[PDB]
Protein: 3C-like proteinase
Amino acid sequence: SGFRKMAFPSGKVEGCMVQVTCGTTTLNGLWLDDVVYCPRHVICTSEDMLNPNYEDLLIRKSNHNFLVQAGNVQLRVIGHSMQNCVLKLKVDTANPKTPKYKFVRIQPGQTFSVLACYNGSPSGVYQCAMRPNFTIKGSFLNGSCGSVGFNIDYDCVSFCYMHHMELPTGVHAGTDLEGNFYGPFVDRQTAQAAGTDTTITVNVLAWLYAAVINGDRWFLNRFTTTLNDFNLVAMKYNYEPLTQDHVDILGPLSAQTGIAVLDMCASLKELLQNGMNGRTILGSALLEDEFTPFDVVRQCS
Amino acid sequence: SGFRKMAFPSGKVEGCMVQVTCGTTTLNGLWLDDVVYCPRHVICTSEDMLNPNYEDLLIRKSNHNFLVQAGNVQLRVIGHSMQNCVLKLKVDTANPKTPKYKFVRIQPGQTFSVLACYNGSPSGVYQCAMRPNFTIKGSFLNGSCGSVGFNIDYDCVSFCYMHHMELPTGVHAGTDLEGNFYGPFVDRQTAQAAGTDTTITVNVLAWLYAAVINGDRWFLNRFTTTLNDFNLVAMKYNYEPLTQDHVDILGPLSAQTGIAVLDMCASLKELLQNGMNGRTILGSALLEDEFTPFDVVRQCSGVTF
Ligand SMILES: *CCC(=O)N(C(=O)[C@@H]1COc2ccc(Cl)cc21)c1cncc2ccccc12
Ligand SMILES: *CCC(=O)N(C(=O)[C@@H]1COc2ccc(Cl)cc21)c1cncc2ccccc12
Structure:
């Protein structure tokens, strides 16, 4: 029993964090086998990146300009290449702590753990979701660039995010481990703004099912709804549309609790109309949207 | 920017988790040097949990009855002893992954990270607080017994909790690493209930300072109060008393934000008497009490391990 925001154990990722220094810029790198991955803006200064030409700046660099530190050991860079917004530094030592891993690109609404690092040293671990506007609401300071997001489903680490920047609203933007940004963002100091954010509807429903599994039923009602009537109400509260894919995904939780998805959808409509009235659900006074249907099944069952 | 519930990196603890099996019971153990620590209820069966004489049950056990597994390697137990509600299994091999560590007993209001395990395998990490009623609002299923709570100071792991049981309300009870329970609980199947809980006042104040650091100021006011007038109001709302020690602990955050502790207390007083009025603080509609003043400074300064 109980429901907590839970991160994956960070040990397999801690053994991969290194510090990458180029000129006056220092950030974090991910050391896997004989390659260190890091944001390409490590080659810029603060005045170089209103409009940086990364191909032009990288060609002027030599292997000995990149200082890589793993613990109190300096690694030797023997090659460098760029793949989209990530820099790949080939090193002369394979990381002996390299876990079984994959690079996966996630979709909005998906969750992952973040290992926040400064100077190649892990400082904390927390749980995050890729917002529908492709930003993440992280907790990051100056020097966190290169910190990674990941999931550990059975022995293998799936790296899904690398931190690159903070937008003016305090939210964060980054790329997958192939250097492709999530969202319409660029690794430039140019004026960029996160689009209006929306609530991850399928995740809220999964979390209402988690509350029923934990014995909370106060918010349930005798109503059902059509999927279209639900979406018409949902859009009015800045909630993401719920597709038939989401309804199918919620099937196992529906079968376990005995409550049809469209029945839970009618409870959600009622909560949005009434509020909580001094009550809480799983210790929260707001509807939580950073637990996926897969997270709920894993934590509850 | 941003404020998250953040746990310590769990790597130093992951290298210590093992599976302990005794008869039909399987739970987790903490392998440090040549000793495996686990809840003493691992030796219990049916009526052994209802009315247990643990000295009597342990004397009947032999070293080979305890199966300890570290990864896909079976460890051999060469001795066994009991210290309060913890069983100590002496093994032939010192854990090569043993970090620098200490056993510390924490006070209510203090926070720690929990590495939830099943079958000696870490499955999740979360940050939580020792409630004033000595329970933890954790997230644990069958098989989680022996999961540990810890903090990190520099490169030293301070183990402060070992999970033993779940109470009928869904809250959790356990011991320090010396086997002494937190709270008025016993390790047996019997009627036990958590006492009425209270809010950790000093932690709420620390979290209001974290919100100010992140640009959330709507709740601030021109007012200040006395520690005695605040404690009168606090008692009325099931809030823990705020001592001069807490006021001193909040000093650095007070200096950084320019909001004196008794000034932040007047803001907290109005929040209790009037509510949030549809507004949120750090994305929450409730006052959060599981971040200590040290947690707030650590996260709003980027201390690493
Ligand atoms: C790694 C720290 C850092 O430089 N951060 C940035 O956002 C930089 C500054 O301006 C930028 C524009 C574009 C890019 Cl791709 C990168 C940066 C950074 C990252 N995460 C959180 C931060 C919080 C405060 C200050 C800087 C932060
Ligand atoms: C390790 C699993 C376990 O046995 N749990 C208990 O709470 C047991 C059952 O009854 C008990 C009475 C006294 C003690 Cl000392 C231990 C137990 C366990 C632990 N944590 C969470 C659980 C959730 C669901 C079921 C069992 C749980």
About this structure: Chain A is about 20% helix and 25% strand. The CA atoms of residues 213 and 223 of chain A lie 20 Å apart. Chain A has three domains: 1-14+100-197, 15-99, 198-301.
